[PDB]
Amino acid sequence: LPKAVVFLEPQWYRVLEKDSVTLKCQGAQSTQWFHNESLISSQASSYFIDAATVDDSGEYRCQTQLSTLSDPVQLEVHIGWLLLQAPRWVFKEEDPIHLRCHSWKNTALHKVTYLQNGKGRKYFHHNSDFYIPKATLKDSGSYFCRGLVGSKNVSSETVQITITQ
Amino acid sequence: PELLGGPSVFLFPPKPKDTLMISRTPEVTCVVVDVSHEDPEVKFNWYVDGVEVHNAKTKPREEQYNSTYRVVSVLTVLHQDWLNGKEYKCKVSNKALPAPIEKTISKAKGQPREPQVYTLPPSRDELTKNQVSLTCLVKGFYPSDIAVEWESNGQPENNYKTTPPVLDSDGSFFLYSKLTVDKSRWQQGNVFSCSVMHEALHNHYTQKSLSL
Amino acid sequence: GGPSVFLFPPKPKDTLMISRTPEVTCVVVDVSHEDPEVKFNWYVDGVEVHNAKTKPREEQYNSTYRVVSVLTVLHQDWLNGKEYKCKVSNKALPAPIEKTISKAKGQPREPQVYTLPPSRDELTKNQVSLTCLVKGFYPSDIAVEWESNGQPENNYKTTPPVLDSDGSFFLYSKLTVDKSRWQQGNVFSCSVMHEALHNHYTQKSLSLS
Numbered sequence: 025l026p027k028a029v030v031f032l033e034p035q036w037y038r039v040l041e042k043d044s045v046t047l048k049c050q051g052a053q054s055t056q057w058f059h060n061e062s063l064i065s066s067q068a069s070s071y072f073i074d075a076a077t078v079d080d081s082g083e084y085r086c087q088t089q090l091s092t093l094s095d096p097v098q099l100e101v102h103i104g105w106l107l108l109q110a111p112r113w114v115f116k117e118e119d120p121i122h123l124r125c126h127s128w129k130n131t132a133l134h135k136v137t138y139l140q141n142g143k144g145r146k147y148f149h150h151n152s153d154f155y156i157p158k159a160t161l162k163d164s165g166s167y168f169c170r171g172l173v174g175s176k177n178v179s180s181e182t183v184q185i186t187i188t189q
Numbered sequence: 190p191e192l193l194g195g196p197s198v199f200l201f202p203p204k205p206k207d208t209l210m211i212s213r214t215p216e217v218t219c220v221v222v223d224v225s226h227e228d229p230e231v232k233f234n235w236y237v238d239g240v241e242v243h244n245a246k247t248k249p250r251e252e253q254y255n256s257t258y259r260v261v262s263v264l265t266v267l268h269q270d271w272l273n274g275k276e277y278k279c280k281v282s283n284k285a286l287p288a289p290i291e292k293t294i295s296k297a298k299g300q301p302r303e304p305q306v307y308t309l310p311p312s313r314d315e316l317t318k319n320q321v322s323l324t325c326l327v328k329g330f331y332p333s334d335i336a337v338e339w340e341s342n343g344q345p346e347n348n349y350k351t352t353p354p355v356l357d358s359d360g361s362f363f364l365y366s367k368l369t370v371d372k373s374r375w376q377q378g379n380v381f382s383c384s385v386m387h388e389a390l391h392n393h394y395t396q397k398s399l400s401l
Numbered sequence: 402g403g404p405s406v407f408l409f410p411p412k413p414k415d416t417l418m419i420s421r422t423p424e425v426t427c428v429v430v431d432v433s434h435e436d437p438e439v440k441f442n443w444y445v446d447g448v449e450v451h452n453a454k455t456k457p458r459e460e461q462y463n464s465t466y467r468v469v470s471v472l473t474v475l476h477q478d479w480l481n482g483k484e485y486k487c488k489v490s491n492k493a494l495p496a497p498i499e500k501t502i503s504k505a506k507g508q509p510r511e512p513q514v515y516t517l518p519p520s521r522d523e524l525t526k527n528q529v530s531l532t533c534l535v536k537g538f539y540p541s542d543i544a545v546e547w548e549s550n551g552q553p554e555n556n557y558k559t560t561p562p563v564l565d566s567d568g569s570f571f572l573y574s575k576l577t578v579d580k581s582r583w584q585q586g587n588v589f590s591c592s593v594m595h596e597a598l599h600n601h602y603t604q605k606s607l608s609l610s
């Protein structure tokens with residue numbers, strides 16, 4: 025009894041409306057897809073969301089003829105200008121941390137700041153991913169990003185990032 | 190114009206006069222600016238204390254010099270609704286925004302304080318010049334919405350300028366109005382009146398005289 | 402994009418008093434950690450001057466740098482409309498940012514100053530309003546203060562300048578004093594400083610009638 029697996033591409037499970045998301049079903053022939061425990065039309069091996077809306081949020085499970093039903097994979101579609109994305113929330117010492125200040129429709133953002141516990145940690149003239157090459161205990165905390173979209177000053181929601189010894 | 194950030198909303202309260210005299214119609218103006226040609230459609234929802242209302246009047250989209258559309262919606266408010274402190278909310282939807290923009294205006298919250306009105310004769314040194322200055326000091330008032338006019342014999346005098354209101358160090362507001370007139374009118378002396386409209390005045394009106 | 406520049410003029414009181422030293426202030430913000438070097442060049446009427454004082458960069462709470470350069474100016478240079486240019490160079494800018502400031506243009510008009518006792522009506526109140534009218538001044542740059550018997554009175558507020566019909570400006574200053582301090586017969590003074598006043602200064606006094 026091999027379990028099918030839902031992979032996200034690109035891997036971010038938190039996305040903004042209008043983002044594209046591909047859900048790939050890894051089993052092993054034919055496919056079925058459940059959204060919020062209910063069958064959707066697609067029987068394709070990879071289910072494609074052209075332009076994400078809030079209602080696309082929730083749980084996805086797939087299955088193939090040679091598979092049992094997959095564990096649920098969560099997708100969260102957020103509404104707003106900015107979303108701070110991460111590969112995961114928990115990191116160990118010396119790992120690299122890669123945060124992304126994703127902006128709506130990938131709109132040009134400038135004068136961008138990544139904040140840790142309300143204090144600026146990194147500023148870029150132009151939207152750029154924040155990189156910590158090797159994590160330390162002192163890097164854990166609450167993060168958001170903000171910037172200028174033209175002249176509008178916008179801000180992402182906060183995320184928690186933990187570093188373990 | 191790149192209009193990268195999409196439209197902006199500005200929400201204006203009614204003119205003080207309009208809120209005070211039943212002869213005038215007070216309105217709150219929601220104006221949406223920096224609307225693009227490519228996503229020109231703007232939707233308005235209006236709310237009073239959280240309750241949605243349908244009596245607004247939206248003008249058609251207006252082509253602007255800067256190569257944007259400007260689009261305006263006016264909601265006529267009822268007189269006592271504004272003075273009771275009811276919150277007016279304009280929600281603006283448009284495809285160049287990831288979410289509707291919500292703006293909220295209401296009257297200034299806080300104890301209304303009654304204005305003291307003091308007419309002040311021109312100084313002894315100005316009394317040698319050809320034209321003199323009649324001062325109306327209006328102080329101790331709250332909120333800052335107020336209107337000040339001048340009259341002589343019950344007919345308007347138009348040769349006056351009024352300051353904005355100024356936050357006084359006691360937390361209330363004051364202003365000064367200056368009426369300039371000929372020296373001989375004062376030496377005679379004609380009777381001038383400084384008249385003021387504010388919610389905390391009985392009948393929303395008071396008048397103070399100035400003579401030699 | 403890159404860092405932004407703000408060029409601030411001197412305090413008007415500073416340009417008018419001999420005992421003071423007016424300065425022009427050039428402020429650079431949003432200077433990155435990557436490109437933190439900032440170079441200033443200053444010009445007066447087009448000729449470069451070398452006596453600006455530049456402060457060490459200060460890291461802000463948001464993790465950008467802020468760098469300030471201050472140029473001391475001559476009162477007369479400013480008052481005669483000379484132009485002050487701050488040129489800022491930094492790696493993150495393709496070209497330097499230039500800012501120029503000067504005194505507002507137009508023919509200076511001498512303000513007239515009048516003091517006004519409280520309206521008789523105000524005498525039921527515990528404190529009274531002493532009024533100083535200042536009118537017919539151009540440009541709008543002005544300083545108004547109050548003093549009693551040689552000591553600065555702090556309990557006044559001044560309206561912003563208001564454009565009068567003839568193109569000049571007027572304002573009112575209101576000093577509040579205890580009603581008993583007024584009934585005592587103290588001399589109160591309205592001090593006005595404007596470029597078009599003789600010695601940039603005048604005083605008009607108010608007292609019990």
Ligand SMILES: *[C@@H]1O[C@H](CO)[C@@H](O[C@@H]2O[C@H](CO)[C@@H](O[C@@H]3O[C@H](CO[C@H]4O[C@H](CO)[C@@H](O)[C@H](O)[C@@H]4O[C@@H]4O[C@H](CO)[C@@H](O)[C@H](O)[C@H]4NC(C)=O)[C@@H](O[C@@H]4O[C@H](CO)[C@@H](O)[C@H](O)[C@H]4NC(C)=O)[C@H](O[C@H]4O[C@H](CO)[C@@H](O)[C@H](O)[C@@H]4O[C@@H]4O[C@H](CO)[C@@H](O)[C@H](O)[C@H]4NC(C)=O)[C@@H]3O)[C@H](O)[C@H]2NC(C)=O)[C@H](O)[C@H]1NC(C)=O
Nearest residue numbers: 135136137147407408409410426428430431461463465467
């Ligand atoms: C990280 O953290 C840093 C530090 O906190 C932060 O820096 C701040 O950044 C903003 C820009 O994003 C900058 O904002 C500018 O502020 C000025 C006025 O600033 C004075 O007053 C504020 C308090 O109100 C005070 O915080 C400042 O320290 C400063 O104080 C003055 O300091 C000087 C010398 O130190 C003293 O001599 C003065 O006495 C003292 N003044 C006071 C009052 O205390 C503002 O400029 C003024 O704005 C008013 C109206 O808002 C105008 O009427 C006035 O003319 C104008 N003066 C001048 C000289 O320009 C700036 O607004 C201008 O630029 C805006 C575009 O950014 C624009 O919207 C405005 O309309 C205005 O445009 C200018 O108009 C004039 C004509 O009016 C034009 O000649 C000029 O060319 C126009 N400029 C244009 C088009 O670009 C602006 O709001 C703060 O000052 C910074 N704070 C500090 C402490 O430095 C970073 O942003 C943060 N970074 C990130 C990524 O988060």
Ligand SMILES: *[C@H]1O[C@H](CO)[C@@H](O[C@@H]2O[C@H](CO)[C@@H](O[C@@H]3O[C@H](CO[C@H]4O[C@H](CO)[C@@H](O)[C@H](O)[C@@H]4O[C@@H]4O[C@H](CO)[C@@H](O)[C@H](O)[C@H]4NC(C)=O)[C@@H](O[C@@H]4O[C@H](CO)[C@@H](O)[C@H](O)[C@H]4NC(C)=O)[C@H](O[C@@H]4O[C@H](CO)[C@@H](O)[C@H](O)[C@@H]4O[C@@H]4O[C@H](CO)[C@@H](O)[C@H](O)[C@H]4NC(C)=O)[C@@H]3O)[C@H](O)[C@H]2NC(C)=O)[C@H](O)[C@H]1NC(C)=O
Nearest residue numbers: 190198199200201202204218220222223253254255257259
């Ligand atoms: C292409 O062209 C477009 C038009 O051709 C252009 O659109 C313009 O965009 C700019 C922004 O870029 C807008 O700027 C606004 O302007 C208002 C004032 O607007 C009135 O007065 C102007 C003259 O000063 C008029 O030009 C304008 O038509 C408005 O006129 C009023 O209209 C009413 C109904 O139509 C009517 O009832 C009035 O009688 C009438 N006239 C007058 C004289 O009032 C700024 O006004 C604020 O407003 C607050 C609350 O309303 C007041 O308390 C403040 O005193 C006042 N500020 C002043 C005088 O400095 C307005 O608000 C500011 O917003 C910025 C940030 O966005 C802040 O820096 C300021 O602090 C202020 O923010 C407010 O602060 C208040 C005080 O505490 C607070 O209560 C508010 O919460 C706070 N609000 C916000 C949002 O933060 C801002 O500067 C123009 O109005 C647009 N012009 C037109 C014609 O619609 C477009 O931008 C161009 N596009 C491009 C790409 O170039």
Ligand SMILES: *[C@@H]1O[C@H](CO)[C@@H](O[C@@H]2O[C@H](CO)[C@@H](O[C@@H]3O[C@H](CO[C@@H]4O[C@H](CO[C@@H]5O[C@H](CO)[C@@H](O)[C@H](O)[C@@H]5O)[C@@H](O)[C@H](O[C@@H]5O[C@H](CO)[C@@H](O)[C@H](O)[C@@H]5O)[C@@H]4O)[C@@H](O)[C@H](O[C@@H]4O[C@H](CO)[C@@H](O)[C@H](O)[C@@H]4O[C@H]4O[C@H](CO)[C@@H](O)[C@H](O)[C@@H]4O)[C@@H]3O)[C@H](O)[C@H]2NC(C)=O)[C@H](O)[C@H]1NC(C)=O
Nearest residue numbers: 134135136137142143170171172177178459461462463467
């Ligand atoms: C888009 O929008 C966002 C959102 O609006 C905007 O963000 C906002 O930017 C503002 C401008 O930069 C910013 O205001 C400044 O904020 C900081 C606040 O941090 C303060 O920290 C103080 C102490 O520092 C720390 O102390 C702790 C413990 O004490 C230590 O652990 C740390 O190591 C560190 O040293 C703290 O005391 C202070 O608290 C303040 O005061 C009391 C304290 O009792 C408190 O009760 C208040 O709540 C208050 O917050 C802050 O938390 C601050 O430094 C700035 O300081 C001032 O600047 C003011 C005007 O700019 C002025 O009134 C002050 O006098 C002081 O100026 C002094 O410094 C300047 C040089 O910069 C100099 O010119 C001047 O002469 C003085 O010497 C100021 O308040 C907002 O915080 C920020 N808002 C948010 C939510 O982040 C963005 O900038 C825009 N974004 C983009 C991306 O473009």
Ligand SMILES: *[C@@H]1O[C@H](CO)[C@@H](O[C@@H]2O[C@H](CO)[C@@H](O)[C@H](O)[C@H]2NC(C)=O)[C@H](O)[C@H]1NC(C)=O
Nearest residue numbers: 059060062077078079080081082083099100101
């Ligand atoms: C699947 O379930 C999720 C609940 O987790 C739904 O997400 C909510 O959607 C509504 C409106 O569409 C929003 O108001 C909520 O804020 C969403 N909640 C969360 C937690 O994201 C989703 O709509 C459901 N989709 C379908 C097709 O049934």
